[PDB]
Amino acid sequence: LTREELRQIAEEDFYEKLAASIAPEIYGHEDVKKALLLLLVGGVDQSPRGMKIRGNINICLMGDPGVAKSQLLSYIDRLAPRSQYTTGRGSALVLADQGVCCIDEFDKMAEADRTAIHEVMEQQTILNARCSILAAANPAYGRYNPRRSLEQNIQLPAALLSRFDLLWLIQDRPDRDNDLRLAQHITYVHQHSRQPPSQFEPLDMKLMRRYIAMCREKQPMVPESLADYITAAYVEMRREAWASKDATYTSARTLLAILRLSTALARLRMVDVVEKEDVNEAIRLMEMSKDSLRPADVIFATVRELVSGGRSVRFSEAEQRCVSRGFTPAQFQAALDEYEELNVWQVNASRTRITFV
Amino acid sequence: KLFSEKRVELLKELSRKPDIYERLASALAPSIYEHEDIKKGILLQLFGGTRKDFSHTGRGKFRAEINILLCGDPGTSKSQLLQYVYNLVPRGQYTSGTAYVMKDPETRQLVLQTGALVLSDNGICCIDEFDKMNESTRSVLHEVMEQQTLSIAKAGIICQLNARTSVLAAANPIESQWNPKKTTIENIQLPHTLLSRFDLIFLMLDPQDEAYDRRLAHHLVALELLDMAVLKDYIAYAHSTIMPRLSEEASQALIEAYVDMRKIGAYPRQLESLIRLAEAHAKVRLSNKVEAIDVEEAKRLHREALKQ
Numbered sequence: 001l002t003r004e005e006l007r008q009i010a011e012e013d014f015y016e017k018l019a020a021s022i023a024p025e026i027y028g029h030e031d032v033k034k035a036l037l038l039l040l041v042g043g044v045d046q047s048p049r050g051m052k053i054r055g056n057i058n059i060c061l062m063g064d065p066g067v068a069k070s071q072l073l074s075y076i077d078r079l080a081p082r083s084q085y086t087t088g089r090g091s092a093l094v095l096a097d098q099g100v101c102c103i104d105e106f107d108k109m110a111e112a113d114r115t116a117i118h119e120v121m122e123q124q125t126i127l128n129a130r131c132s133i134l135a136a137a138n139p140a141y142g143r144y145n146p147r148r149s150l151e152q153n154i155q156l157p158a159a160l161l162s163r164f165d166l167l168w169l170i171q172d173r174p175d176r177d178n179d180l181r182l183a184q185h186i187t188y189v190h191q192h193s194r195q196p197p198s199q200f201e202p203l204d205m206k207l208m209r210r211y212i213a214m215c216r217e218k219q220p221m222v223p224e225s226l227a228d229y230i231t232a233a234y235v236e237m238r239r240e241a242w243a244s245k246d247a248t249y250t251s252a253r254t255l256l257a258i259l260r261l262s263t264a265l266a267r268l269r270m271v272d273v274v275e276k277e278d279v280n281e282a283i284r285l286m287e288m289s290k291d292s293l294r295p296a297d298v299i300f301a302t303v304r305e306l307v308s309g310g311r312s313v314r315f316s317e318a319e320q321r322c323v324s325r326g327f328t329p330a331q332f333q334a335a336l337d338e339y340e341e342l343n344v345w346q347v348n349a350s351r352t353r354i355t356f357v
Numbered sequence: 358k359l360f361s362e363k364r365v366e367l368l369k370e371l372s373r374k375p376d377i378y379e380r381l382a383s384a385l386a387p388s389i390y391e392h393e394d395i396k397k398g399i400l401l402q403l404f405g406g407t408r409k410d411f412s413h414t415g416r417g418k419f420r421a422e423i424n425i426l427l428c429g430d431p432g433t434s435k436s437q438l439l440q441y442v443y444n445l446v447p448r449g450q451y452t453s454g455t456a457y458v459m460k461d462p463e464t465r466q467l468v469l470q471t472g473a474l475v476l477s478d479n480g481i482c483c484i485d486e487f488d489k490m491n492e493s494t495r496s497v498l499h500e501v502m503e504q505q506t507l508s509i510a511k512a513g514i515i516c517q518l519n520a521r522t523s524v525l526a527a528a529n530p531i532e533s534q535w536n537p538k539k540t541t542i543e544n545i546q547l548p549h550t551l552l553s554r555f556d557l558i559f560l561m562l563d564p565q566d567e568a569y570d571r572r573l574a575h576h577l578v579a580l581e582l583l584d585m586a587v588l589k590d591y592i593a594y595a596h597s598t599i600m601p602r603l604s605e606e607a608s609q610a611l612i613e614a615y616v617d618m619r620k621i622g623a624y625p626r627q628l629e630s631l632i633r634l635a636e637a638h639a640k641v642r643l644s645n646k647v648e649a650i651d652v653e654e655a656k657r658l659h660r661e662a663l664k665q
Contacts, residue, residue: 249432
């Protein structure tokens with residue numbers, strides 16, 4: 001780019017403007033726009049210790065007909081530098097090397113081609129097939145049924161869905177105000193030949209293409225400090241997915257996907273080191289994607305800490321420990337009396353020892 | 358022939374280390390974690406047994422090559438391990454779930470083309486998604502598993518082919534999840550013949566233990582060289598040079614092992630597999646005689662696999 005144009009990209013809230021600039025003609029779905037932007041950016045590719053890891057982001061968008069999936073696919077085909085737009089029957093993977101393969105009517109294809117798709121997804125090879133797969137799908141009956149399981153509603157194997165690093169469900173939920181807003185936006189787009197006036201005018205396609213090309217040039221390195229936090233977050237997510245039977249199998253592929261998302265965010269912000277904000281944003285995006293489918297008590301605890309094998313507790317030790325915690329002796333006496341009312345314990349008349357009932 | 362004296366001396370020095378076996382277990386598939394028994398079994402299969410000709414006895418050529426079956430959830434180390442074995446082992450073959458007739462355009466004569474199984478003769482053949490294969494192919498597999506030969510009688514073409522290959526198969530349970538049951542068929546639905554033909558069956562279960570997930574995630578985020586390059590030539594040297602033979606003490610140990618094993622249920626084929634495993638371990642130690650240690654280790658591994 002010309003650096004002045006990069007500054008023209010780098011105003012405040014630039015991430016939101018870039019997300020909205022992709023397919024602004026379709027109201028809402030900012031999360032899907034962010035996912036497509038990260039797919040355009042993509043993660044990093046590394047070959048450590050004899051194995052090759054993927055940085056490509058493959059996203060599967062499924063929804064009832066009429067949720068403007070085809071228009072999103074056409075727009076991303078137009079915007080991506082190397083993009084191959086194809087249908088279920090109509091087929092390409094090699095032609096979109098180092099690019100984006102946008103395929104629609106995925107659910108309307110025979111399993112024989114699906115079997116070959118798995119190798120492309122897992123190893124980006126066929127020949128090399130290093131491409132980002134963007135798949136579109138529809139429910140089997142024409143309407144998504146939340147009663148049925150996800151696999152049955154998608155009629156695809158669980159492994160194929162797992163190999164997709166991102167799954168986005170769009171449902172045509174009838175809301176009166178939302179329907180009226182969508183209708184009026186469609187009317188304005190139809191009449192005025194233009195998008196409705198938003199807060200910020202979206203950037204040009206060429207400018208966005210150049211920005212993506214420049215952001216792909218950088219290869220951020222993951223710091224070792226955030227590794228422990230990433231492991232803790234992955235543990236929490238996998239525990240949650242184990243507790244829920246209907247959640248997708250959170251194998252190593254989920255951790256690889258979130259690492260790819262963090263690296264893509266780091267490339268987007270043009271920083272050679274991945275920060276915790278990128279990790280938090282990746283966790284937020286994954287969570288949204290999976291969602292689409294008194295002094296008395298403190299003093300009582302303080303004196304409870306001194307019940308290590310004893311029934312009676314000295315008054316002075318408890319008083320000193322309570323004062324060390326930041327409580328005045330008046331509050332200590334008040335808490336002692338209040339918990340004495342509850343028949344918890346009895347205080348000696350000499351105020352030297354307390355016997356716990 | 359292909360080794361200088363210094364290479365043989367270095368191999369002897371390495372073999373004199375009592376830990377080399379376990380160290381070689383650490384050498385196999387560094388990216389794979391906490392599957393030491395599986396690596397041990399793979400190494401034993403690489404060593405294999407010794408070939409014996411029973412022409413004077415009137416018996417057929419007994420199989421002397423080891424086959425291992427793996428079963429578990431998809432997305433695990435199956436495909437990566439199979440690729441590692443195929444890349445490391447020369448003449449290895451990778452297939453997913455035979456001979457055929459081709460017309461000669463010159464003489465109009467029907468000639469034969471050899472499938473991957475025949476092409477991998479004296480090599481290792483690895484198969485993914487064993488459960489998802491047609492029943493006709495699995496019916497064919499019985500002959501190659503048992504007699505190491507293959508006979509065809511079709512359209513007047515009658516032929517017999519040698520198929521000295523080792524089968525390393527990966528399978529997926531029918532439930533796609535380890536349902537709490539008793540027999541492996543209740544989860545995988547395989548006939549008793551194919552299961553009995555396998556020398557070693559291992560099951561990959563992802564435990565619901567938090568610390569295991571910690572270790573897996575750390576190994577992933579954090580994701581030797583002196584060993585595998587030497588090991589290829591070391592395995593070639595062991596195959597070409599040494600052959601173990603059975604002893605009286607190991608004879609008594611194997612007899613006792615068989616009579617104890619049948620009380621649990623037992624077929625003579627598992628006894629043959631135990632003999633083969635003892636030969637493999639003797640080759641591992643580069644010992645020309647099979648001793649108590651080989652039999653004890655083979656029995657330990659078999660009992661560990663059965664317990665799991």
